[PDB]
Design a protein around this nucleic acid. Structure first.
Length: 49
DNA sequence: TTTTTTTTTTTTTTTTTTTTTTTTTTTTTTTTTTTTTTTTTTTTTTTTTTTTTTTTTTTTTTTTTTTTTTTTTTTTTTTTTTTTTTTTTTTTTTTTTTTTTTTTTTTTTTTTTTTTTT
């Protein structure tokens, strides 16, 4: 939801992971960074999903 | 106004314990030295027809010493018991998976101050 609200569309240019993690932690997820980034890393990598 | 009782932290330095620097013994690790395997070719060894004079088996008969034989008494064999080892259920502990809670370190760059050595 944070990546959709930011506008991280698949055909648009990339955005840094720090901005997305900061936006998620600031707005939606109250559980602090370094665990949202692990979920993002797992969702990105092709041998896990 | 002078004088009298009591209380504790310090002059403490010494005894006990703890912490921190040390170096003998069995378990790793790199080296040299000896067991394995594949090619060349090479004189050398070795596979297969022909002839040949040989020397051991099969007609026949003989005996004697190993094959018959019965029996006493041993002694290896088997029985029970118990110990030692092997092997497998049982239990315990530890590790990895993915979202969470927490933290912790090493260096550049300059300029100024402490803090030891000569």
């Amino acid at each position: 939801y944070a990546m959709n609200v930011l506008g991280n569309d698949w055909n648009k240019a990339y955005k840094k992971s720090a901005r997305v993690v900061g936006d998620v932690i600031g707005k939606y997820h109250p559980h602090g960074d370094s665990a949202v980034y692990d979920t993002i890393v797992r969702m990105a990598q092709p041998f896990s999903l």
